[PDB]
Structure formats: structure tokens, C-alpha cells
């Protein structure tokens, strides 16, 4: 599950990452995903 | 009278009197719950 905020909803299961989207949308730049286009 | 009342005395401010015409017919296989006996003898007019 999402190991940030105990999120059992909104998971993305790609690449064995299991973060929810609402925690991925602010931690993307620290991971490396930057908004380009 | 209060004996012939399906619901409580609230009909001035609540529901409609609900009619429940109970058509109880018995099917006999030996040992049967209410569900299968409800599935066996349904009649629609």
C-alpha cells in the first residue's frame, strides 16, 4: 500500500512502487519525475 | 382496536396499511429450509 499516509485507495502498482497518486503528485520531483510537457 | 394492526398507531402521520396475502403452500421433500420451499410454489396471478 502507500507507505506515506496509509492510503488504501488510489494506488498505482507500476514498477513495484505502490504509492497513492495523492502522494505521488508532490514527491515526483524528489524521485525524478519533473513536469516538462 | 389494537389487535388487528399490522403496523403501529401512526397511520394519521405515517404509512399506509400494508397488505400481506400469505399464500402458504407446503412442498414435501424430506428436510427443507424456508428458502427452497419459497422457491418451489410461487404463483403469480
Amino acid at each position: 500500500q502507500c507507505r506515506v499516509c496509509s492510503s488504501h485507495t488510489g494506488l498505482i502498482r507500476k514498477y513495484g512502487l505502490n504509492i497513492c497518486r495523492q502522494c505521488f503528485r508532490e514527491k515526483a520531483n524528489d524521485i525524478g519525475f519533473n513536469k516538462f510537457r | 382496536e389494537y389487535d388487528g394492526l399490522t403496523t403501529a398507531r401512526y397511520d394519521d402521520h405515517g404509512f399506509l396499511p400494508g397488505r400481506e396475502q400469505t399464500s402458504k403452500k407446503a412442498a414435501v421433500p424430506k428436510g427443507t429450509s424456508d428458502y427452497q420451499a419459497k422457491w418451489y410454489l410461487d404463483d403469480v396471478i
Partner: protein, 135 residues
Amino acid sequence: SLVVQEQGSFQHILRLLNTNVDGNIKIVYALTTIKGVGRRYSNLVCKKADVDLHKRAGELTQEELERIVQIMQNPTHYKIPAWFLNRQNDITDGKDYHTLANNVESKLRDDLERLKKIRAHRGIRHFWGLRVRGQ
């Protein structure tokens, strides 16, 4: 190819295996009129017996009709194997058969009353549905 026309000797409405067929469409699609025989089964039955299917069903002879009828009850002897048949590995006798137009309804009624005397959910669901939407 070549046009070949004959003075008469074609029948409009014929009858085979106590079922009516019409003699102006091709043989396969005159044999789709009977029930329990579709397109592909009739193609296989007619192309076993070296019947030209480009020509029509009005010029069918009786010796073709008798050999088609002779194909119908035992197709297994003439290299029509198991997976083309409707009755396959039955619970009653354990063999394979192709059910006919007056036997598809006996098969369906036999399956439904068998589900009734088994008292399965499929049977009581189907007869409850029939007895409720019928009424």
C-alpha cells in the same frame, strides 16, 4: 463457366426426413431450413458425398437424398468425427450422435426435466422464470 439448363425436372418444394426443404437455393442453405443442421455441418455432410455445391438443390436426385439421409444417423463411420456433433459423450449411453429436427426438442425437454428431478439451481431457476414471465 458453362450454362446447362434442363426442360423441367426441378421441384419447388421438396421434403426430406419428414421436413420440408425448398428446391431453388443451394443444397447447404436448403439444409439450413431443417433444425439441428446448420451451415457447416451441411457443408461437411454434402462434401463427404462428392456433391457439387455450386449447383442448386432443385436438380437433386433421389439417390443423393438417400445417401444424405444415410449419412445423417451414423456420421461416425464415414469420417465425420466427434467434435462436429451435438450429442457428444452423453450421460445416458456414453456415445455420440447428431440430433435431428424432431429430436432437438426431446433433448431440450429431457435436459430440463432431468434438471427438475435432479432439483438443481439451473432447473428451478429456469422453471421459475418460465412460470413467472409466462403468467
